[PDB]
């Protein structure tokens, strides 16, 4: 079957020539073409230059004409790229896709059907280890509700697991989406939705379940009036 999977090197460092490998589920591209797809975080996405599976020809993004190179050989299941000069806009979810070999309307029309797993490959400029937790103690125990929370700044690598109350979530807990920073590190402010009825008794301990650290720093509601 023509099913695709790619991981390459994962999260990388800027100003370096990365190599994002990709694989096939046995559907050899003997006549079809393979291609890359870059999907920016949210919103739109951009197409990276496709490859000619049958021949040795390489097509590229006009703005990135010389930046992309791939390795092709007799086996059709091994497609690995050699993207050069990774930039700040390369932090996106890459993809693999297979060109239509034949159809009743046309033959090589790019209406990609087979698609890969897809992973978020970033361009974070530094490792910078892991996050820290910041409480959100309310003024009271305009509004009558007092909502606590947490702030987990500079977490790496993307992603890092977070839960609540050792997994024993009580009611309507949630987490904010991942947002990057200008320096390259990833920060988040894990604040939970709080009802305007049960106050002074509810507890929302923040479970930052980082892979090496895995700490469960306490966080409760207290007056700050």
């Amino acid at each position: 079957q023509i099913h695709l999977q790619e991981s390459g090197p994962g999260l990388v460092r800027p100003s370096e020539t990365l190599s994002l490998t990709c694989d096939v589920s046995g559907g050899a591209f003997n006549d079809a073409y393979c291609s890359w797809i870059r999907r920016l975080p949210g919103g739109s996405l951009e197409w990276i230059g496709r490859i000619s599976g049958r021949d040795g020809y390489v097509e590229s993004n006009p703005s990135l004409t010389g930046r992309v190179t791939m390795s092709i050989d007799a086996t059709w299941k091994k497609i690995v790229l050699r993207l050069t000069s990774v930039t700040a806009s390369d932090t996106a979810t890459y993809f693999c896709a297979g060109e239509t070999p034949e159809d009743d309307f046309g033959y090589y029309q790019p209406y990609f059907k087979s698609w890969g797993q897809g992973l978020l490959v970033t361009v974070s400029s530094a490792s910078t280890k892991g996050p820290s937790v910041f409480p959100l103690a309310p003024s009271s125990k305009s509004g009558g509700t007092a909502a606590l929370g947490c702030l987990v700044k500079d977490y790496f690598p993307e992603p890092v697991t977070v839960s609540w109350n050792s997994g024993a979530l009580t009611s309507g807990v949630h987490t904010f989406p991942a947002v990057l920073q200008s320096s390259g590190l990833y920060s988040l402010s894990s604040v939970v939705t709080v009802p305007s009825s049960s106050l002074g008794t509810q507890t929302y301990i923040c479970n930052v379940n980082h892979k090496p650290s895995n700490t469960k720093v306490d966080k409760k509601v207290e007056p700050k009036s």
Binding site: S52, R54, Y57, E59, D104, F105, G106, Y107, Y108, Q109
Partner: protein, 53 residues
């Protein structure tokens, strides 16, 4: 179509007497071709080799 087709003579139908044919036409993209379909009678097409051509 209408199956009855008001068949007074009931002689038959064109089916299995014409060969609905298509051929490639060039395009700007490298190695990409379309189909320009047409209908031709069997008396104006022959096959030499390369079955289904």
């Amino acid at each position: 179509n209408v199956n009855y087709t008001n068949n007074f003579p009931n002689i038959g139908n064109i089916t299995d007497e014409v060969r609905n044919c298509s051929f490639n036409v060039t395009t700007e993209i490298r190695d990409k071709k379309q189909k320009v379909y047409a209908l031709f009678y069997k008396l104006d097409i022959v096959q030499m080799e390369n079955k289904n051509s």
